Amino acid sequence: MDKSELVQKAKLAEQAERYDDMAAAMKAVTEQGHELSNEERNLLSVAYKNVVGARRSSWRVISSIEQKKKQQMGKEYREKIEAELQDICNDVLELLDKYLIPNATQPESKVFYLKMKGDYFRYLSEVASGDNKQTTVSNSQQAYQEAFEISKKEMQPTHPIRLGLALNFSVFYYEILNSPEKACSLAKTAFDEAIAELDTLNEESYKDSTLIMQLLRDNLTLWTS
Amino acid sequence: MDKSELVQKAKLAEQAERYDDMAAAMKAVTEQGHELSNEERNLLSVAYKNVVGARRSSWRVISSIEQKKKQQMGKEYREKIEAELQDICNDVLELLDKYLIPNATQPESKVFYLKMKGDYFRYLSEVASGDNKQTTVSNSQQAYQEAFEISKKEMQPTHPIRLGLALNFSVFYYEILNSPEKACSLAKTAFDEAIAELDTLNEESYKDSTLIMQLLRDNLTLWTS
Amino acid sequence: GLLDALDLASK
């Protein structure tokens, strides 16, 4: 099991649409304890995004339907999906805490993995109750904030990762904390700082930075009303 | 775990797109050893069709890609998918042999379950080698033939199930036995017998019978050339 | 759905 072998496996898995495999491959790769390359890193993240992304979508479907006598079936099912979603997120957080974040040597990746830790705790927050929920919401924000402090020290305002952090962190406020004024504030700031440094935009990724900028604008102009 | 409970679970699973669940639900339902209703039956079959249907699609993807030095990865992967496909098919055949077919009390369902046994052995044949392959191909045809003998004794030529049996059995010949002249023969016959008894077509399902008739026609007119 | 349940080798 070369690292090269595992990566081909994952690239195939991806091609085949078996994302539990693609994730298991990258989780294997990650457990060899070397800093992931950018590509290695980007697969793990895509793999896991699709894995959990299917339970999130499924959960929503089952919760939409729940909102129609012996409905304790919707509930017993929801909780199965939820239990499963919690295990995927704990995988990724164990990985982030044990390997990705400590093995991270450089701004671009330190932020990326802290954003991801924010994401996954946010995902847990969607299905969490009581004490658990307060701990989740709070570790989500705490990870988002640490990535942002570092992105502000170390990256252009136009950096896709940094823009992508602002985007996710803004939604964290809107959807999870239910603080829209803050979601907007956090987003106008991130937008305005990017549109100031327009000369910094590199043609070499201009379309990505400008993509996420339009995403940011989207949410604002929706969110104002 | 009422039979009623399991069925709601499966209907949800279906709605949620978690077909391993939907199949596990129906496999549970089926293990209580009562004859499945038509609806019960139709879920199990839809559930399992989607379950195995994803490995079949995945297998094809990986085998298309294989046909581009250290490619023993495509192969080690293909075989994982294959092993997994074989377990799904053995599930269903165990179920068919242990419960569905013996618990079957009536032409419509006796044929349905024998068609299905044909299908699944055909699915195994796609991934099988040597002695295994000869046994598979042969049990597929043997199950197709027994369903057909019974469909010919007991059903109209226009019966959706019976038409659907002819369709699958014809493709068995074309794709698995590589005997197109027979695939055509078997299909013209089934078509012609239906278009003779046009008065028997019931408005109450006219569109289905006529659907599958057009499928049959499709293959012929393709297959002639 | 019966048609769906009959996994047709298809068109």
Added chain:
Amino acid sequence: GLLDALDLASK
């Protein structure tokens, strides 16, 4: 793909 890898809370 970086954008894909960044699972954007989306548009």
